[PDB]
Point group: C3
Chain length 183, copies 3
Amino acid sequence: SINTLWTGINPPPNCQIVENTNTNDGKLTLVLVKNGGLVNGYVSLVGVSDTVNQMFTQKTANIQLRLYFDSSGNLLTEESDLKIPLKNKSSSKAFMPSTTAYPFNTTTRDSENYIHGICYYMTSYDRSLFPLNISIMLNSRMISSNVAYAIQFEWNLNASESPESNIATLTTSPFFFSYITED
Amino acid sequence: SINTLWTGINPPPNCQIVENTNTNDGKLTLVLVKNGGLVNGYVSLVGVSDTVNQMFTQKTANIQLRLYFDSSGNLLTEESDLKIPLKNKSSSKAFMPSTTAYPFNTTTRDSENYIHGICYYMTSYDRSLFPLNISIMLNSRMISSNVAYAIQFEWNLNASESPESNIATLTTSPFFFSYITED
Amino acid sequence: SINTLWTGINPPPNCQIVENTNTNDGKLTLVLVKNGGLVNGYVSLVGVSDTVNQMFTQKTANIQLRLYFDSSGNLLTEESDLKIPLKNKSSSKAFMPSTTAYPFNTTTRDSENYIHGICYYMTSYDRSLFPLNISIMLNSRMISSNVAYAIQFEWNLNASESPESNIATLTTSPFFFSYITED
């Protein structure tokens, strides 16, 4: 119990997808559950701005969300794309990605710093599914400051046709993952 | 501990795949584990009737299983395709899908009510794998009555060739998922 | 708490990929977490020997790792490809695959003894992703002795082109799974 760090169910716009957009244009739902040596995660994204919700009118698209954490395990909102700190339900460090399992400053050892999977986008018209490649990069590149941990999410759409012809709420079906915690 | 709602390991025929089949023609193994703000799930299906175990002689097939729950979190067996209530191992409401994260009566917000993935069918002859698209829909459509929650599973086979030439035990490899609980 | 059986984060070479190789040529990271009636798992592999790290110069490849356990839930290292016993973090039987859900000596019932999924290999040059079919077989074939449980991992590369032209650290992106425990 009380072993859950998250963005809260239906959070307000809390991240920035478009660079240079003083306003949050996306809604990221991230749920991290401590479960022994593993963190059980859940991640889905919803777009809010007209710009975000138009990215799927093109056959190709990329969305990246970077989370940087300090030694205590607190989200460094100024440097991260997620602008609202995570909470608990009703020791953030225990929800963080092991710097041992996932080491920093290493390209010789950067490969074991990635989780790769597939999630989907359901079109607004015929409700068809477009697969989205999703990658989660743990630690590895500490942007700067006193970044003690990092979690970067990236969704990539690479289709032969555009999933939408016009504005439609961008949504990424839920991607499940786990990673070894710093305990 | 005691935070697990399931159908029991090797249950008897407990669901109805073919509409209008007074008898249960399938064996659904569903395991739901409470783990903080997330339910960790496991689902696999085994076919029992000659009819079910012949669905894979065609290149296309669809199987749907709807679970409807009341406010307490109890399976409404008369309305659901699963006909035997779930049990525990030796607060069902805490195993239910958040009506906040996954709202009812909403097509404007029905997309974030789906989990989509792939699981597999292993042929009885050359043991080859056929991918099965699987979708889990949370709440969204409350069939009727005092349905407080809903979980619908759907497997879809869409192949160029038929996986089987004759009767063979239909089996769906295990699909893992998670969803935000009503806590 | 203390409900986690694993190989330890960055273990030393601990398994044998190439048959007849008195020395361990691979690093397997396996994390098993007890979570109610389900074990939550995480598995990734890193190759150490020049031979292992050359397997991806061919368009096709197969890697198999067999774990055999005794009644207590202890790894039988002499018969298994994993040569170092698992530990805990700071009742192995409770981390074992149910012999009920996953029965032995049964091909009539061998299909429900498999978990199938996809994980990836990131090439060393252009960092592209090659999908790897992964299969986990639970119990089913008890090699011999007093094998009370079995977990076999198998990764298969089947590409049109070879992912690498020369030696490169073989790595399999993390595959997540769950199975019903013997409780």
